[PDB]
Ligand binder design. Structure first.
Ligand SMILES: [Mg+2]
Ligand SMILES: [Mg+2]
Ligand SMILES: [Mg+2]
Ligand SMILES: [Mg+2]
Ligand SMILES: [Mg+2]
Ligand SMILES: [Mg+2]
Ligand SMILES: [Mg+2]
Ligand SMILES: [Mg+2]
Ligand SMILES: [Mg+2]
Ligand SMILES: [Mg+2]
Lengths: 122, 64, 95, 95, 46, 72, 201, 87, 242
RNA sequence: AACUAAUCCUAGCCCUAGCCCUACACAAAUAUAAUUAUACUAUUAUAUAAAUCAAAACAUUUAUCCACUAAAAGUAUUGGAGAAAGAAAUUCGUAAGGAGCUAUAGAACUAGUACCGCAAGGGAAAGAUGAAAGACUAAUUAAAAGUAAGAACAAGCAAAG
């Protein structure tokens, strides 16, 4: 006679049964049943200063939209790194070892914002 | 010049092109040609269909 | 009797008949006399003489055996020196 | 070893075919138990002088069990193989 | 007495007996799940 | 990583962040990414169930073309 | 859904929810499938009625329900009905247009009033244009007001609306830095700690 | 209407590709190879020498013949002894 | 509907698709080329023809292998192809009596064997049949190398086969170190079984183990596109200057 | 002179033929009492299929269940030599459609849903306007049983002469 089709949540079951609704944990439970919040585990919203901002939620109809071109890795490379290498190649001051000079990162370890695996949320 | 028998022009199931028989024979013939390429449930039903027909045609009927 | 066999779909011969009866192509069947090898020491000489003979079958018995045997056992067999050569045909019978 | 034979014959299968079995082809009778059979002997040529069974360089026969446990493994004796006999026969000749 | 009230609901009893973890414990229970997935059932277990 | 569950399917497994290696984690060594032989029969049945469904759809589209050609 | 009939009312209106309840199982309409390239009827194009009540009368397309291969012409194939009927008042009698299938109408030669058949063909610039099968000519796409009703040219800038020039402004600088790294540098946040090793699995 | 061209059996020798797993096995045995030669002769491409048994194959046939099919003299010799025993 | 291929051919297609196909050619041949194991529990027909006593006519005869059950414990021992015979018997050896279940078991023994090539002594569960086979092979090492995969009937034995073959193939100095004379003798004595090193590695491995071995060999972290574009750019610039 | 009702055509389905597959579904969560972001206690199919049923019982036994077409051949063989079972050698072969279904039919299916059982599991029913509903949802029919319109009037298988 139990309803099998309804979702299993903490409102149901005895007192002992509990579970989260998806809220991210922000602290630790120490011995003796004491909660110790950790400030670093609490997200902090980085909010910019909007003074002098010239952009509003809606855009004018008169303004014409452009052609959609999903950005690709090749396109970014040509814009940023290709010109430096091209000029350097003419000057001859280019070597395989110093690709980092143009911005190459050998490993993501040591970066605050690791590209992969991502260590930063949206 | 008898190059092709007319039976070769029939379009139908592989196990009964140019052949005719009663259902029990038809059941066994379907198994022979495509017994190894049949689905599990279809093969199970065919096996049961054969066993039913066998006991009917070989143990029942008005004439002995 | 197996009227329709699974593997081939044909009628099956009963081998109890093949081992007891001989069919002549005309349609007659031959058989032995039951007990011709049994307790011969208490049977009379005339009694034993009858048993040794080969006997024919009736229309019903012949009809039965024809249902229990397949056509292969009803064909013509051209055996050289056959001791049943002359008996496969009926002659001077009006009926 | 246990050597078994079926009670029910298996119809011939052909050349490129396998003899599909049935539940009656799993009834076995005991052909022979090889363990009870009389045992052979083990022929081995000594690599080192053996105790009371000969001197080194002499081919000897042992009762199977004795050779395997000690002579074959402890290095006292070596297998009497073709090459082994050939090599030792050279030492025997050069004496 | 009066029958008909055999079902004495307890969520701890229910989930232990016919739950997801209980079913996966044994292969005989996993084959219960496997058939239910074949049929198309809304709920595979409790 | 592409891995197989105990129900005989290929499932894309998203990894999680852990403070200890996998071989020392006793909750990871309760999850199973393999299938026993008894899932073999069920694997084939899904193939046939999908094959049946796919066959019916193709036949249905064929009829709809016939109706259109009859109409026009 | 398999059982959904497209009618004359714009989908999602009160009329279309009333006509098509979730339990509706009306007989499907059979529509000759027409490729996107094949279709040549567009809103605003003058067409002529091949057959019907108003056969031989030219009209202007004002609606195209491609799901039903329908083209609606203003003031033609028009029957009568009462709009705004109330319990107190009968309402106002109006003449309501009825949908026409494409094969019952034809496009009109831009210069001359005749039902000239057209074919799709490219131009020197490469833009696809309709060309008359006979008396080959370019019939331009007819400019029509947008369904939303917003008029671009007359639109006046207001609060919460960006100026046209401001939107056109481009300031993206291609650089191998994420948004998470550009903001901190611009906003001057400094963090020297680094996350400990994590065993992903 | 004009009828389609009459159905025709494919002419010339036929050699299947052994790679394909659905090709019937009997269509790949050496016996099937000889059939190709007989039907179309040289155009089959079968090495004519291959038709005759190979030396290892030849020993197989010769070994069997001695085992089961004796010589004329042996048959006559045994028959005489049997008559003598019966006599 | 109908499957395009018969069910029994599915295994072959499985080997022919995906990473399975990429496995080395010689290993794939090993799996499919399963040769009936040598008779152990039945006496094979000496001839292909026999004279039936009843009718006295020449009749073809065939050898039908007895089904034997190999418990997984056997994979960790060295049985000479032996296994469990699960069958039925007629009480009192007459078919008119009841049919009774019977299981015939091998008299397993545990002994210690020394491998010259490995120079290590293993303790293994071994039947008297294997002991005779080892004696007829004139050494434990000869027995492992000579016996094919099927006749051996053990996963433990196959690992020994790979270990011995790899030892001979590489001429590893780890065999009897600091005594080169001793090492040379062993290698020469078993020189006949030497095979190429690459082939030796793929000996006795199962499909899963071979699949795991291949996956590890082909595992590689994705190349950064940065480098890939740089290589293309440099080549184009170099060619233009040329 | 009508209530209850009835009429209806396409939703899908069936059997073949061809064809191995490469439909493995953003992001997030789930083996913990599944779908709960992090450590605790770690994780692993199965020894021979049985029986019904047939032998007018039953006890040995009992096709399919459990390796190319046709021929040899239901032959040789096997079998409480009963019911029954049953070869091979050796020959032969280049291989998209509907005298199907049309809503009690065809799949159980509008759905493995509602509902029922603690669970394994079992398992439905039904829809119908027109070109346009941005034309006040059509039609169509003395037509089933059941009623009404219109209770009954000595006497009786209810009718027949
Ligand atoms: Mg044959
Ligand atoms: Mg109850
Ligand atoms: Mg209670
Ligand atoms: Mg029994
Ligand atoms: Mg009975
Ligand atoms: Mg009884
Ligand atoms: Mg139905
Ligand atoms: Mg139903
Ligand atoms: Mg009525
Ligand atoms: Mg009256």
């Amino acid at each position: 006679g139990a309803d099998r089709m309804s979702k299993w949540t903490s409102k149901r079951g005895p007192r002992t049964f509990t579970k989260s609704r998806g809220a991210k944990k922000t602290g630790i439970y120490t011995s003796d049943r004491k909660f110790v919040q950790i400030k670093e585990m609490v997200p902090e919203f980085v909010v910019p200063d909007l003074t002098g901002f010239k952009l509003k939620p809606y855009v004018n109809y008169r303004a014409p939209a452009g052609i959609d071109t999903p950005l690709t890795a090749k396109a970014l490379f040509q814009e940023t790194v290709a010109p430096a290498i091209e000029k350097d190649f003419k000057e001859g001051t280019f070597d395989a070892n110093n690709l980092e000079k143009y911005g190459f990162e050998p490993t993501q370890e040591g970066k605050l914002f690791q590209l992969y695996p991502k260590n930063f949320p949206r | 010049n008898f190059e092709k028998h007319p039976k070769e022009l029939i379009k139908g199931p592989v196990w009964l092109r140019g052949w005719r028989g009663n259902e029990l024979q038809r059941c066994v013939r379907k198994k022979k040609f495509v017994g190894n390429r049949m689905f599990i449930e279809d093969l199970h039903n065919l096996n049961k269909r054969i066993s039913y027909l066998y006991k009917h045609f070989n143990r029942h009927g008005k004439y002995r | 009797l197996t009227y329709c066999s699974t593997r081939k779909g044909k009628r099956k011969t009963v081998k109890s008949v093949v081992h007891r009866f001989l069919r002549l192509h005309s349609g007659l069947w031959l058989r032995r006399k039951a007990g011709y090898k049994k307790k011969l020491w208490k049977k009379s000489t005339a009694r034993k003489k009858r048993l040794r003979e080969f006997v024919f079958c009736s229309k019903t018995q012949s009809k039965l055996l024809d249902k229990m045997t397949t056509s292969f056992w009803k064909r013509r067999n051209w055996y050289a020196g056959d001791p049943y050569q002359m008996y496969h045909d009926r002659t001077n019978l009006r009926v | 070893t246990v050597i078994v034979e079926r009670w029910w014959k298996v119809p011939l299968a052909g050349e490129g075919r396998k003899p599909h079995l049935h539940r009656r082809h799993r009834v076995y009778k005991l052909v022979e138990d090889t363990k009870h059979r009389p045992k052979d002997n083990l022929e081995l040529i000594l690599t080192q002088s053996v105790d009371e069974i000969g001197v080194r360089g002499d081919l000897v026969s042992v009762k199977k069990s004795v050779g395997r446990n000690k002579l074959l493994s402890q290095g006292l004796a070596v297998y009497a193989s073709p090459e082994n006999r050939k090599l030792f026969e050279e030492e025997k000749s050069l004496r | 007495r009066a029958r008909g009230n055999e079902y004495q609901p307890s969520n701890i009893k229910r989930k232990h007996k016919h739950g997801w973890v209980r079913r996966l414990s044994t292969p005989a229970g996993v084959q219960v799940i496997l058939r239910r997935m074949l049929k198309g059932r809304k709920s595979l277990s409790h | 990583a592409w891995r197989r569950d105990i129900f005989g399917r290929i499932v894309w497994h998203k990894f999680k962040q852990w403070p200890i290696p996998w071989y020392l984690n006793k909750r990871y060594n309760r999850r199973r990414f393999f299938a026993m032989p008894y899932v073999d029969r069920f694997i084939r049945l899904r193939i046939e169930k999908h094959a049946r469904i796919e066959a019916r759809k193709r036949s249905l589209q064929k009829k709809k073309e016939k109706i259109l050609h009859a109409k026009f | 859904s398999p059982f959904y009939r497209y009618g004359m009312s714009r989908p999602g209106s009160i009329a279309d929810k009333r006509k098509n309840p979730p339990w509706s199982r009306r007989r499907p309409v059979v529509v000759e499938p027409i490729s996107d390239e094949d279709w040549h009827l567009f809103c605003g194009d003058m067409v002529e009625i091949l057959e019907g009540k108003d056969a031989g009368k030219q009209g202007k397309v004002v609606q195209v329900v491609r799901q039903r291969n329908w083209v609606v012409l203003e003031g033609l194939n028009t029957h009568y009905r009462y709009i705004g009927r109330t319990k107190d008042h009968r309402g106002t009698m109006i003449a309501s247009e009825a949908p026409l299938l494409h094969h019952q109408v034809k496009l009109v030669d831009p210069v001359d009033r005749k039902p000239t058949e057209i074919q799709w063909r490219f131009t020197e610039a490469g833009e696809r244009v309709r060309v008359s099968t006979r008396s080959g000519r370019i019939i331009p796409k007819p400019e029509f007001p947008r369904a939303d009703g917003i008029v671009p040219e007359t639109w006046t800038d207001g609060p919460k609306d960006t100026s046209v020039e401001d939107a056109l402004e481009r300031t993206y600088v291609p650089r191998l830095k994420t948004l998470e790294e550009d903001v901190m540098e611009a906003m001057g946040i400094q963090e020297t700690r680094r996350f400990k090793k994590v065993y992903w699995y | 209407y004009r009828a389609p061209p009459p159905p025709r059996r494919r002419p010339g020798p036929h050699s299947p590709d052994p790679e394909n797993l659905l090709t019937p096995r009997w269509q790949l045995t050496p016996r099937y190879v000889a059939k190709q030669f007989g039907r179309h002769g040289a155009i089959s491409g079968v090495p004519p020498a291959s038709l005759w048994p190979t030396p290892e194959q030849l020993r197989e046939l010769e070994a069997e013949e001695q085992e089961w099919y004796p010589s004329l003299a042996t048959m006559q010799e045994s028959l005489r002894l049997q008559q003598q025993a019966l006599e | 509907p109908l499957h395009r291929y018969p069910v029994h051919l599915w295994q072959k297609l499985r080997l022919r698709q995906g990473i399975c196909a990429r496995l080395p050619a010689h290993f794939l041949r090993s799996l499919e080329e399963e040769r009936t194991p040598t008779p152990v529990h039945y006496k094979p027909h000496g001839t292909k023809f026999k004279i039936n006593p009843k009718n006295g006519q020449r009749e073809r005869v065939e050898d039908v292998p007895i089904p034997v059950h190999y418990p997984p414990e056997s994979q960790q021992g060295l049985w000479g192809g032996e296994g469990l015979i699960l069958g039925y018997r007629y009480a009192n050896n007459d078919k008119l009596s009841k049919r009774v279940k019977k299981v015939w078991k091998p008299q397993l023994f545990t002994r210690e064997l020394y491998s010259e090539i490995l120079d290590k002594k293993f303790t293994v569960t071994v039947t008297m049949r294997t002991l005779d086979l080892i004696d007829e092979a004139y050494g434990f090492d000869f027995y492992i190398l000579k016996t094919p995969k099927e006749d051996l009937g053990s996963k433990f034995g196959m690992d020994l086969k790979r270990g011995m073959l790899l030892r001979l193939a590489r001429q590893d100095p780890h065999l009897h170190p600091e005594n080169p004379e001793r090492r040379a003798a062993i290698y020469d004595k078993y020189r006949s079984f030497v095979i190429p090193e690459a082939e030796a590695e793929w000996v006795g491995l199962t499909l899963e183990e071979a699949l795991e071995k291949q996956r590890l060999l082909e595992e590689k972290d994705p190349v950064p596109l940065f480098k890939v574009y740089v290589e293309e750019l440099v080549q184009r610039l170099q060619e233009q200057v040329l």
